[PDB]
Amino acid sequence: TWELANNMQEAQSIDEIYKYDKKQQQEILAAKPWTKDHHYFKYCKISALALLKMVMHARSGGNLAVMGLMLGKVDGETMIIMDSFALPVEGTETRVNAQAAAYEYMAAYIENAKQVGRLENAIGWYHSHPGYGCWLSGINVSTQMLNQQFQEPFVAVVIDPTRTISAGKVNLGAFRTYPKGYKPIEDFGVHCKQYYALEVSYFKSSLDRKLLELLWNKYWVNTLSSSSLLTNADYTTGQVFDLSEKLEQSEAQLGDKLAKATRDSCKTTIEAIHGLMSQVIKDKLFNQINI
Amino acid sequence: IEAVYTDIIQGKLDQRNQLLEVDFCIGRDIRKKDINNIVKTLHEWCDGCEAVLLGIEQQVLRANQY
Amino acid sequence: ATTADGSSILDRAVIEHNLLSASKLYNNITFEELGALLEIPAAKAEKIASQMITEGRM
Amino acid sequence: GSVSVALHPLVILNISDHWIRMRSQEGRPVQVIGALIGKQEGRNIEVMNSFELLSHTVEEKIIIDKEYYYTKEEQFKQVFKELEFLGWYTTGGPPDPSDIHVHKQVCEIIESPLFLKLNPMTKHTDLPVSVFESVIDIINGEATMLFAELTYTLATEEAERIGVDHVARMTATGSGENSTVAEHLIAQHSAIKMLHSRVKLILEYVKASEAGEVPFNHEILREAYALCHCLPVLSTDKFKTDFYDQCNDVGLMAYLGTITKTCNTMNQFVNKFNVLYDRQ
Amino acid sequence: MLIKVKTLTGKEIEIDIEPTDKVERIKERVEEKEGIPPQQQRLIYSGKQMNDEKTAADYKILGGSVLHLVLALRGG
């Protein structure tokens, strides 16, 4: 009653994305929609479990560099990833070569997962960059060339362990690449024309959501003493600046983007009012007792 | 200054406003007749918390309905 | 040995330490009160305070 | 007391993912069996990761096969070096005798295995997981394996908190029609309820001391008085002015953002109007 | 003579090999059918990489066990 909806067994589309429609996957693979246009999938959604597994692998690597695979599927315009799987590769923090150990490891792990009951396939790979941002190098560009031109459904992931640890936010970067021939900012590197970037999103199930909320529930002091909107001021100002640029672009276009601008403005306003609401609730609870 | 050094209260002085601000002071002795008053204050706090809870529920319910 | 200012080495480091410690237990202090507890009559307390700043000490 | 258990916020996610995978695959939720791996440091046991173990069914009983575990044990040794067998987990409620039977061959494989219980059908504030240690009875006859409940901690490395906050900020609230209010106003409601429970416990102790059930401990009451005197926090004018400035700023930020949603609806209305009642 | 090759992405290849054929020869044919580069194929047979020097001599198999091919994938 207090939570109203609660959950005994009911779910929604959030829990629906975890399945394997064999006929649907077969027909999208056979139709091959992305082989006809270069500007295909721009949305990549990766589950939480894969994220933490990648982060732990990168941290266990230390100052050196690690490298592993990933598992998932593709659905329409979007890409779904929900598994991480590390590899036993070694090398200097500036270069790593996959020896025969990884070649015998990926196949063995795939067979073990198939025996377990897993049904997904290889979708890409993740490589850790210890310090030098998140950008594909020349050898990475060539490897992504060959991988996306031989194994069309693919995507690369680059993270920065050191900067993630120091700053406090993750450095997940999902990249697809433009094939050879199609020709039509120093941070991204020197091959900025050959490779581009993609947006990142996350999901979690109903059971995962309940477990995460109940585990994070042992954070009450920080929960009611955080006083947000005083820590994310720079983020909100940057969001408003990007809102202004998007609004200008939409106004120029009118002479759609307006829907995207409206959604972004709604998100920022919702965050601001949520911060104000938490502040008001704290003031009501603490400052209105004993006169 | 010497009282702060003894660490019985924690705070800072301000000569411009002629004020002393205390962030935390140790509780003094309690006789066995004032305890009831203590109860009262705690009771009040509890009531306030309960009130907030009620409001929370109402608000979220309305939101969902909308 | 003195620092050619009439004050020895000991009662200049101790004065700077007193000034630094007073910065944690005060919000704003007048020059007269700062010199009252530092033995400076009125004048060189301000000079010492200004010297202790612009170097990151206080 | 036995061993100190160090649980990590990674095994639980593995169990939940496995459970949802099986529930979606088979439609009717079933029981899942896995493993737990980690480190043994003297009298301390810590869990790092967890991989599923294949389990066969014979008649009505469940049997853990040894060959698959033997093949998979050396496979993950390449990536994780100082990682060793600790125990296994399963989904369920109370410890049934089938748990004892399945734990028999686990004790055969490893002398003293741990046990993890995850209950997806929980309706209590306590942690759904539970850690059990195996004890061999001395009474003659059917020597049942006794489960001794221990305490589980929440030891985490540096990157756990940031990751859980990053994933929990969004939770796909805008796609499932769950309403962002039903997330924000509810997440802190539990914390407020916990604070209410703690204050209620303190008040109950103070009342009991007043009545005479508990001895007159003339040390806790002083702290209770000090806590009582610190309730009206920051009732100065500067705080009120700052709070009012914050409220006005957030109100203006909401005005700029309502004024654009209204404009977008305005644009969609004129676009639909220029086709129905006016040609071209 | 009717061997099957399954990759980790889903591509299925059916190839015909004389039992006494060389390993370079089978790579050359599978590159002809699909388009693999001549020197960048890793071939896995029953969880064991096929040695290039060791020519195939005894294929005591009619289906079932399948060699999975994988590309060299490396970064820096």
Curated annotation (Swiss-Prot), chain A:
It comes from the Eukaryota. Its main location: cytoplasm. SUPFAM superfamilies: JAB1/MPN domain. Its EC number is 3.4.-.-. Residues 44-181 form the MPN domain. Component of the CSN complex, composed of COPS1/GPS1, COPS2, COPS3, COPS4, COPS5, COPS6, COPS7 (COPS7A or COPS7B), COPS8 and COPS9 isoform 1. In the complex, it probably interacts directly with COPS1, COPS2, COPS4, COPS6 and COPS7 (COPS7A or COPS7B) and COPS9 isoform 1. Interacts with COPS9 isoform 2. The CSN complex interacts with the BRISC complex. Also exists as monomeric form. Interacts with TP53, MIF, JUN, UCHL1, NCOA1, HIF1A, CDKN1B, BCL3, GFER, PGR, LHCGR, SMAD4, SMAD7, ID1, ID3, ITGB2 and TOP2A. Part of a complex consisting of RANBP9, Ran, DYRK1B and COPS5. Interacts with IFIT3. Belongs to the peptidase M67A family. CSN5 subfamily. A motif (JAMM motif) lies at residues 127-140. InterPro entries: CSN5_C (IPR040961), JAMM/MPN+_dom (IPR000555), JAMM_MPN+_peptidase_M67A (IPR050242), MPN (IPR037518). It comes from Homo sapiens (Human). It is an enzyme of class 3 (hydrolase). One of its GO terms (cellular component) is nucleus. Zn(2+) binds at H127, H129, N140. Keywords: Acetylation, Cytoplasm, Cytoplasmic vesicle, Hydrolase, Metal-binding, Metalloprotease, Nucleus, Protease, Signalosome, Synapse, Zinc. Changing H127Q: Abolishes ability to deneddylate cullins, without affecting the 'Lys-63'-specific deubiquitination associated with the COP9 signalosome complex. PROSITE patterns: MPN. Its cofactor is a divalent metal cation. This is COP9 signalosome complex subunit 5. It holds the Pfam family JAB. CDD domains: MPN_RPN11_CSN5.
Swiss-Prot record, chain C:
It comes from the Eukaryota. It is found in: Cytoplasm; Nucleus; Cytoplasmic vesicle, Secretory vesicle, Synaptic vesicle. Belongs to the CSN4 family. Component of the COP9 signalosome complex (CSN), a complex involved in various cellular and developmental processes. The CSN complex is an essential regulator of the ubiquitin (Ubl) conjugation pathway by mediating the deneddylation of the cullin subunits of SCF-type E3 ligase complexes, leading to decrease the Ubl ligase activity of SCF-type complexes such as SCF, CSA or DDB2. Also involved in the deneddylation of non-cullin subunits such as STON2. Component of the CSN complex, composed of COPS1/GPS1, COPS2, COPS3, COPS4, COPS5, COPS6, COPS7 (COPS7A or COPS7B), COPS8 and COPS9 isoform 1. In the complex, it probably interacts directly with COPS1, COPS2, COPS3, COPS5, COPS6, COPS7 (COPS7A or COPS7B) and COPS8. Interacts with TOR1A; the interaction is direct and associates TOR1A and SNAPIN with the CSN complex. Interacts with STON2; controls STON2 neddylation levels. Interacts with ERCC6. This is COP9 signalosome complex subunit 4. It comes from Homo sapiens (Human). The gene is COPS4. The chain holds residues 291 to 348 of 406 of the full protein.
Swiss-Prot record, chain D:
Residues 5-138 form the MPN domain. It holds the Pfam family MitMem_reg. It comes from the Eukaryota. Gene3D superfamilies: Cytidine Deaminase, domain 2 (3.40.140.10). One of its GO terms (cellular component) is perinuclear region of cytoplasm. Component of the COP9 signalosome complex (CSN), a complex involved in various cellular and developmental processes. The CSN complex is an essential regulator of the ubiquitin (Ubl) conjugation pathway by mediating the deneddylation of the cullin subunits of SCF-type E3 ligase complexes, leading to decrease the Ubl ligase activity of SCF-type complexes such as SCF, CSA or DDB2. The complex is also involved in phosphorylation of p53/TP53, c-jun/JUN, IkappaBalpha/NFKBIA, ITPK1 and IRF8, possibly via its association with CK2 and PKD kinases. Component of the CSN complex, composed of COPS1/GPS1, COPS2, COPS3, COPS4, COPS5, COPS6, COPS7 (COPS7A or COPS7B), COPS8 and COPS9 isoform 1. In the complex, it probably interacts directly with COPS2, COPS4, COPS5, COPS7 (COPS7A or COPS7B) and COPS9 isoform 1. Interacts with the translation initiation factor EIF3S6. Interacts weakly with RBX1. Directly interacts with COP1 and 14-3-3 protein sigma/SFN. Interacts with ERCC6. (Microbial infection) Interacts with the HIV-1 protein Vpr. Belongs to the peptidase M67A family. CSN6 subfamily. This is COP9 signalosome complex subunit 6. It comes from Homo sapiens. The gene is COPS6.
Swiss-Prot record, chain E:
The modification N6-acetyllysine is found at K48. Residues 70-72 are annotated as: Interaction with UBE1C. One of its GO terms (cellular component) is nucleus. GO terms for molecular function: protein tag activity; ubiquitin protein ligase binding. It is found in: Nucleus. Gene3D superfamilies: Phosphatidylinositol 3-kinase Catalytic Subunit, Chain A, domain 1. The record marks L8, I44 as: Interaction with UBE1C. It holds the Pfam family ubiquitin. Its main location: nucleus. Highly expressed in heart, skeletal muscle, spleen, thymus, prostate, testis, ovary, colon and leukocytes. Cleavage of precursor form by UCHL3 or SENP8 is necessary for function. There is a cross-link at G76 (Glycyl lysine isopeptide (Gly-Lys) (interchain with K-? in acceptor proteins)). It comes from the Eukaryota. Keywords: Acetylation, Isopeptide bond, Nucleus, Ubl conjugation pathway. The modification (Microbial infection) Deamidated glutamine is found at Q40. InterPro entries: Nedd8-like, Ubiquitin-like_dom, Ubiquitin-like_domsf, Ubiquitin_CS, Ubiquitin_dom, Ubiquitin_ubiquitin-like. One of its GO terms (biological process) is proteolysis. Belongs to the ubiquitin family. Ubiquitin-like protein which plays an important role in cell cycle control and embryogenesis via its conjugation to a limited number of cellular proteins, such as cullins or p53/TP53. Attachment of NEDD8 to cullins is critical for the recruitment of E2 to the cullin-RING-based E3 ubiquitin-protein ligase complex, thus facilitating polyubiquitination and proteasomal degradation of cyclins and other regulatory proteins. Attachment of NEDD8 to p53/TP53 inhibits p53/TP53 transcriptional activity. Interacts with AHR; interaction is direct. Interacts with NUB1; interaction is direct. Interacts with ESR1. PANTHER family: UBIQUITIN. This is Ubiquitin-like protein NEDD8. The gene is NEDD8.
